[PDB]
Write a protein that binds this ligand. Structure first.
Ligand code: HEM
Length: 154
């Protein structure tokens, strides 16, 4: 697929707001994911044991991971499609080391869209949510293709 420049503009415009508070958006998105699809919290050996949202909010580890995720995703979105090199290392560790199914990446894409919408309603109308969705779908289609080349396709 190929996003038009106007769609990338809408995606990078709302992402610039996310970047004013990366750690906070990171926390929100992961808790959103773990509350919605708790089985995903099992993939994290570091803080699998967290029982409640309050515990999750107080975990420094969870907040660092959220920043690592968002920093890596933002470097991929900024490429505007030319992300081949950033994807490789990412696909290899999630398919071989952590064993993350494509399905789970759909769940987090869903959590990212939920949070942008709640935090940024003015910059996240229907056209901007459509563009973000296109950008995340593109990301998942290329990572799934790389999983396949790596022998995992989950
Ligand atoms: C926007 C999607 C995602 C991005 C960009 C992302 C990015 C990253 C990055 C950069 C790291 C650190 C380096 C590495 O291990 O390769 C990481 C580690 C990890 N990721 Fe992801 N990830 C994504 C989705 C997920 C999902 C959906 C799961 C879980 C259901 C997952 C599970 C993990 C685990 C278990 C680790 C290790 C955590 C720790 O021990 O430090 N990731 N991820």
């Amino acid at each position: 697929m190929v996003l038009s420049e106007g769609e990338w503009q809408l995606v990078l415009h709302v992402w610039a707001k996310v970047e004013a508070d990366v750690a906070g958006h990171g926390q929100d998105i992961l808790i959103r994911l773990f509350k919605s699809h708790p089985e995903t919290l099992e993939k994290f050996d570091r803080f699998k044991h967290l029982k409640t949202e309050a515990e999750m909010k107080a975990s420094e580890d969870l907040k660092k991971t959220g920043v690592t995720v968002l920093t890596a995703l933002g470097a991929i979105l900024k490429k505007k499609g030319h992300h081949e090199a950033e994807l490789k290392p990412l696909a290899q560790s999630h398919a071989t080391k952590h064993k993350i199914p494509i399905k789970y990446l759909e769940f987090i894409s869903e959590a990212i869209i939920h949070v942008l919408h709640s935090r940024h309603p003015g910059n996240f109308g229907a056209d901007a949510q459509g563009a973000m969705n296109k950008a995340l779908e593109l990301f998942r289609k290329d990572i799934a293709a790389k999983y396949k080349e790596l022998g995992y396709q989950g």
